[PDB]
Amino acid sequence: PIESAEDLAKQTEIAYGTLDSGSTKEFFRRSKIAVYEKMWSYMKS
Amino acid sequence: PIESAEDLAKQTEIAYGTLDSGSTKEFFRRSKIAVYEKMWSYMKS
Amino acid sequence: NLDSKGYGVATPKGSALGTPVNLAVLKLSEQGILDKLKNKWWYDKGEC
Amino acid sequence: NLDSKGYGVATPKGSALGTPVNLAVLKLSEQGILDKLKNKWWYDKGEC
Amino acid sequence: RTIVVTTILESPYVMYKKNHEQLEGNERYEGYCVDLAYEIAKHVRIKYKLSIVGDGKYGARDPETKIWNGMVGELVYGRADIAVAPLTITLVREEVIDFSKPFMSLGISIMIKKPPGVFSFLDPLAYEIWMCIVF
Numbered sequence: 001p002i003e004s005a006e007d008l009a010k011q012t013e014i015a016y017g018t019l020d021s022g023s024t025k026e027f028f029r030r031s032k033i034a035v036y037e038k039m040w041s042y043m044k045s
Numbered sequence: 046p047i048e049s050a051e052d053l054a055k056q057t058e059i060a061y062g063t064l065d066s067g068s069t070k071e072f073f074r075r076s077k078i079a080v081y082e083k084m085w086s087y088m089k090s
Numbered sequence: 091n092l093d094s095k096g097y098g099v100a101t102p103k104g105s106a107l108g109t110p111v112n113l114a115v116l117k118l119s120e121q122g123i124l125d126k127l128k129n130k131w132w133y134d135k136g137e138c
Numbered sequence: 139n140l141d142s143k144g145y146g147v148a149t150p151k152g153s154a155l156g157t158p159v160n161l162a163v164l165k166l167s168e169q170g171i172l173d174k175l176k177n178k179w180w181y182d183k184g185e186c
Numbered sequence: 187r188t189i190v191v192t193t194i195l196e197s198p199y200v201m202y203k204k205n206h207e208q209l210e211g212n213e214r215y216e217g218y219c220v221d222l223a224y225e226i227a228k229h230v231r232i233k234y235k236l237s238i239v240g241d242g243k244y245g246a247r248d249p250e251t252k253i254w255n256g257m258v259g260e261l262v263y264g265r266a267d268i269a270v271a272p273l274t275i276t277l278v279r280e281e282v283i284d285f286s287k288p289f290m291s292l293g294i295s296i297m298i299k300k301p302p303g304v305f306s307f308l309d310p311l312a313y314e315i316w317m318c319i320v321f
Contacts, residue, residue: 010134010135011137012137013137046298046301047296047298050092050296053296059298061296064244065243066243066244066245066246066255066256067243067244067246067274068095068244068274068276069294070246071246071276071278072092072093072168072294075168077169078170081092091292091293091294091295092293092294092295093170093173093293093294094173094291094292094293095167095274095275095276095288095291095292095293096274096275096288096289096290096291096292097271097272097273097274097275097288097289097290097292098273098274098275098285098286098287098288098289099222099226099268099269099270099273099285099286099289100257100258100261100268100269100273100279100283100284100285100286101261101267101268101269101283101284101286102261102262102264102266102267102283102284103282103283103284104284105267105284107189107230107232107267107268108284108286110229110230111226111230111268111286112286112287113229113230114225114226114229114230115226115286115287115289116287117229118222118225118226118229118289119141119142119143119287119289120141122141123225124142124222124289124290125141125142127218127221127222128218128290131198131217131218131221132198135198142291144288160280161277161280161281164275164276164277164280165277168276168277
């Protein structure tokens with residue numbers, strides 16, 4: 001069903017996450033590309 | 046079953062309605078077209 | 091559609107905000123802000 | 139379409155014909171005159 | 187100084203957030219119209235206070251009482267400054283309030299609930315073809 005990273009941000013039924021302490025969490029946290037902070041704010045709360 | 050407003054106005058087993066105080070209600074209230082006049086009469090009655 | 095019309099931003103008659111709000115609406119329309127807002131809130135949030 | 143806009147009936151700024159023309163356009167819109175004119179001059183006259 | 191902006195609860199124009207009860211002010215709401223009000227108040231330098239209409243109506247003139255309700259009533263009687271909401275431009279409203287140019291097009295539409303035979307083997311050819319085949 002999913003074919004890109006934007007599909008994850010555009011939907012709600014499927015959750016997603018990453019490691020608590022790792023480069024991926026910081027990449028999502030300090031990113032400034034709209035989809036990336038969107039999916040960061042999703043899994044922040 | 047229904048494809049246009051005329052089909053909705055001619056039939057009787059399926060009722061129709063709208064908001065109490067909104068632009069659609071006054072659209073039907075002050076319409077001078079025969080089909081919309083019939084629909085307004087039905088909804089009022 | 092039974093007819094064609096549209097939504098508007100309403101201010102009281104004689105208010106000083108009418109012209110600035112109308113120009114703001116025009117600015118948003120020409121910059122594509124309204125289009126992207128509609129795509130964000132209607133199409134991008136389809137769950138079906 | 140690349141954007142959405144519309145045609146307007148233009149008058150000089152501050153002219154006394156502004157509000158009456160706006161109300162006339164609205165009245166023609168609610169009575170279906172504009173839709174009827176568009177059908178008459180575009181579709182009913184379809185030559186293909 | 188601060189400008190009150192009336193509106194109405196309607197998806198996807200104004201929505202309560204998931205944790206709205208824990209939030210105060212413009213952070214409670216989300217939707218198309220809150221973003222529209224934010225952009226409008228960013229263009230013309232004002233500070234706004236979103237305020238859902240009390241009776242939850244759009245606006246209509248009582249035939250006998252002759253008193254408006256809803257957001258049109260909010261604007262006419264000075265209890266609001268701007269109505270950033272899905273408010274339709276109509277002749278009866280245009281004579282008591284000032285409408286900007288349309289920010290979204292729309293129309294009246296009908297909503298209904300959603301909703302092969304035994305001889306479906308006879309389908310890939312037209313009925314005239316079957317008649318001509320028999321002839």
